[PDB]
């Protein structure tokens, strides 16, 4: 996995690859690693896929309860605090490496949250097995107060460096631009690897499979 984040002029941009590997075998070519927390708070997940899935789901749920009760738009520091304290109690056994990006009454913020419960507020960050490829691209060309198009370009380049450089990363680049007027979920913002077509003419003539038993159960009675 290569997940990255970046703080620009009017917001934050979260980036992620779309590959899920089951120990050197690509299981999913198109998985969503950018999760919703609140309308202006999103989260990239890396680490143990189930732990990242259930921890993001849990905090989005706690944040809906928090927003319903308070009557206010949720704060990025609250989602970090909730995540941190839950992860700390599990002593790293909940393997969720998260990049929390969002916009609140205090502006755009970006955080890296680790499985043990430690965190960091940063202008740019990268997590996952492909984090060093993404981080090299960010260190090489990040400049503060970038325009939306300049920051999106840097983010796509950073996630792409990880996709091509890391065996545990691949597929497409997903992105999420968060600004004061909401979030633009750019699923498949770029596909570094163009359609790998083939002359896959593998048809079987009906009857080539030898059958021993057959039973038909109709359902038209219920319909």
């Amino acid at each position: 996995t290569t997940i990255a984040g970046l703080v620009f002029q009017d917001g934050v941009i979260l980036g992620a690859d779309t590959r899920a590997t089951n120990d050197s075998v690509v299981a999913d070519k198109s998985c969503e690693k950018i999760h919703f927390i609140a309308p202006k708070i999103y989260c990239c997940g890396a680490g143990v896929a189930a732990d990242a899935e259930m921890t993001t789901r849990m905090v989005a749920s706690k944040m809906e309860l928090h927003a319903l009760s308070t009557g206010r738009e949720p704060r990025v520091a609250t989602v970090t605090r909730i995540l941190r304290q839950t992860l700390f109690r599990y002593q790293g056994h909940v393997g969720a490496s998260l990049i929390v990006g969002g916009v609140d009454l205090t502006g755009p913020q970006l955080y890296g949250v680790h499985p043990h419960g430690s965190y960091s507020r940063l202008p740019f960050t990268a997590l996952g097995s492909g984090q060093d490829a993404a981080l090299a691209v960010l260190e090489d060309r990040f400049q503060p107060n970038m325009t939306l198009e300049a920051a999106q370009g840097l983010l796509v380049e950073a996630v792409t460096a990880g996709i091509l450089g890391d065996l545990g990363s691949g597929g497409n680049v997903d992105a999420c631009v968060i600004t004061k007027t909401g979030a633009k979920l750019l699923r498949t913002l770029s596909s570094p690897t163009e359609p790998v077509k083939r002359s896959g003419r593998y048809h079987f003539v009906p009857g080539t499979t030898a059958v021993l038993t057959q039973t038909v159960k109709p359902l038209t009675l219920e319909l």
């Binding site: 789901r57 849990m58 749920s61 809906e64 309860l65 319903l68 009760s69």
Partner: protein
Amino acid sequence: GYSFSLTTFSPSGKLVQIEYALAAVAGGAPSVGIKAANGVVLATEKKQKSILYDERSVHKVEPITKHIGLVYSGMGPDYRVLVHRARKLAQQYYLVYQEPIPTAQLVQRVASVMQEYTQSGGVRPFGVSLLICGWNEGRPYLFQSDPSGAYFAWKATAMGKNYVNGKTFLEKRYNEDLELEDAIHTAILTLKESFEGQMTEDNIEVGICNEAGFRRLTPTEVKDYLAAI
């Protein structure tokens, strides 16, 4: 704690504490619910004792989730308990099934909590009747849940002060094919039957629920509906 029930059967087979809780609801401010063909309206009398009350600080028409909403008649503090519990229950359903809770499922889970308070030790029942609205099967839902823990699906209904008369007005003014905008007009009209004084967009509260989810009407939207009378 007191481990014995505070609600018990009388020699005539009545749960007198639930009947007295219903009297608290009957004394409460009016509430109306109307299930239109393409949505649901919830309207309530939000009349305050003085001008000094900051009207926009507390609300009677409350969201439970993105597609479910609530209103009540009776005890305000008891209501808040049920809203917190209903919001919580709707999040538990969402974590498990990854799908917004069907209105009937939420009503059933909240009705169970209300029933507990009629049998559990050292507690009295809630002095609240709820009116829950929702949108889930490409269709609208309106339910009433009373202090005993019993629930009813309604096309239209009234609760609180002058509720028996509100239900008769609704009976003759309700049609299954009414549209949401017309149903908001009808809902305000049912409240106007028992409203004492002049009805402004600050002493009544309206909530709607359609394909786009549940939301409260802003005082500007309530003003535009009151302009029509």
